[PDB]
Amino acid sequence: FVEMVDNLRGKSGQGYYVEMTVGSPPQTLNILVDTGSSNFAVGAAPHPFLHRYYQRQLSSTYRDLRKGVYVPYTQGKWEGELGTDLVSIPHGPNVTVRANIAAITESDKFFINGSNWEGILGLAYAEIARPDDSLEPFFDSLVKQTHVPNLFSLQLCGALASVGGSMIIGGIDHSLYTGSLWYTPIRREWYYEVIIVRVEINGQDLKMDCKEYNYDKSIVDSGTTNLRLPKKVFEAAVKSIKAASSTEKFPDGFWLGEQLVCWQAGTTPWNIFPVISLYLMGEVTNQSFRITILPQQYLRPVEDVATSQDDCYKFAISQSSTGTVMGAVIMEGFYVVFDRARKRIGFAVSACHVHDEFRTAAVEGPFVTLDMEDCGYNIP
Numbered sequence: 167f168v169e170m171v172d173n174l175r176g177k178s179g180q181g182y183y184v185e186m187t188v189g190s191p192p193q194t195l196n197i198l199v200d201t202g203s204s205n206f207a208v209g210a211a212p213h214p215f216l217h218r219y220y221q222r223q224l225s226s227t228y229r230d231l232r233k234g235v236y237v238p239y240t241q242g243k244w245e246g247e248l249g250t251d252l253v254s255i256p257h258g259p260n261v262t263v264r265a266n267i268a269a270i271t272e273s274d275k276f277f278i279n280g281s282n283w284e285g286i287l288g289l290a291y292a293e294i295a296r297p298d299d300s301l302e303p304f305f306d307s308l309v310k311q312t313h314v315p316n317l318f319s320l321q322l323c324g325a326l327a328s329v330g331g332s333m334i335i336g337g338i339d340h341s342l343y344t345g346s347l348w349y350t351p352i353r354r355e356w357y358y359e360v361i362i363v364r365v366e367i368n369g370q371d372l373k374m375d376c377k378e379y380n381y382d383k384s385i386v387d388s389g390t391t392n393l394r395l396p397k398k399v400f401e402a403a404v405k406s407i408k409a410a411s412s413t414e415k416f417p418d419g420f421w422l423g424e425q426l427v428c429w430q431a432g433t434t435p436w437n438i439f440p441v442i443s444l445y446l447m448g449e450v451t452n453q454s455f456r457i458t459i460l461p462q463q464y465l466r467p468v469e470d471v472a473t474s475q476d477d478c479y480k481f482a483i484s485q486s487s488t489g490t491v492m493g494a495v496i497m498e499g500f501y502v503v504f505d506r507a508r509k510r511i512g513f514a515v516s517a518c519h520v521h522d523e524f525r526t527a528a529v530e531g532p533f534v535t536l537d538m539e540d541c542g543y544n545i546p
């Protein structure tokens with residue numbers, strides 16, 4: 167509803183976070199909202215990059231599960247002790263839940279200097295929870311212990327500059343989007359998986375086996391900044407993007423995200439960059455719809471070198487070895503409904519998306535698409 171509107175804050179490229187309390191009495195922490203993971207973890211010991219932490223010994227409702235958890239990732243990792251405790255979301259539904267909490271005791275390159283978050287809130291399914299799927303994810307405890315409907319939605323506005331947005335727990339707020347909401351099935355409940363059935367750059371079909379678009383998997387992830395495409399898809403998109411923007415040449419570091427591009431203030435030539443469209447498998451047979459983002463979405467604003475004058479941007483579309491990842495770049499143009507009860511994901515044009523007087527992000531349908539089921543990938 168209304169109280170929840172505007173409850174999301176953050177640092178550009180550092181993640182969107184919500185305020186939560188834990189323990190009795192209530193210990194306040196800022197928690198990162200992550201649809202790309204399934205554990206509820208918080209700093210539970212002093213840390214150079216932490217302004218505060220979870221002090222388990224100060225909580226009367228704290229119960230030790232006497233179990234441990236180890237989460238290692240590409241570069242770095244976190245580790246901690248499991249237990250339960252009461253948990254609330256001050257600017258969310260008026261309810262208190264007993265949930266699992268991983269008390270982060272050790273970490274390597276996990277917390278980010280100046281991010282303002284002290285923990286993570288995984289909203290994905292139990293399948294990808296750590297240690298195993300037996301550790302009930304927090305949103306699963308929410309729905310079980312209360313009458314909060316099994317659904318939530320995200321409006322990431324982003325427009326280091328601080329960002330904002332809103333997480334609506336248990337419902338939909340028509341005031342956060344324009345047009346109609348189009349839904350695509352959640353292929354399988356682990357990540358928030360979907361199926362891309364076609365890709366177009368500047369109206370031109372990327373023309374390639376749709377299976378390539380979901381090579382390994384396609385997931386909607388708020389815990390990722392970029393729009394990550396599988397290698398082959400990436401190279402094809404970057405090529406198509408250069409062709410459309412050809413009127414102006416840019417260095418190879420740009421396309422690789424290794425360097426930024428600057429223009430005289432308020433002079434960015436958006437019109438030279440093309441719109442991008444992802445077609446998603448619909449709910450009705452042989453039916454698809456498309457979401458369309460602008461350069462205002464994939465060109466993310468960064469701070470220059472020393473200077474501040476010019477308007478500097480980094481190409482926020484990067485290569486992937488882990489499938490298509492629809493991160494903040496895709497999410498910031500849309501109001502996204504994570505309808506867990508009806509096993510689907512809704513997309514509508516975001517009332518806060520950044521655009522101009524010529525174009526606007528879009529969500530359209532339906533389109534006739536055959537064998538969209540074949541677009542999904544399966545292990546050998």
Ligand SMILES: Nc1nc2ccc(Oc3ccccc3)cc2c[n+]1[C@@H](CNC(=O)C1CCCCC1)C1CCCCC1
Binds near residue numbers: 237239389
């Ligand atoms: N959503 C998402 N949560 C994750 C959550 C936790 C995690 O353990 C770590 C992460 C960094 C260091 C040590 C351990 C990895 C994740 C990976 N993901 C995405 C990548 N993002 C990130 O690592 C951010 C998340 C928030 C914190 C900074 C790191 C994946 C999802 C699958 C496709 C590939 C990208």
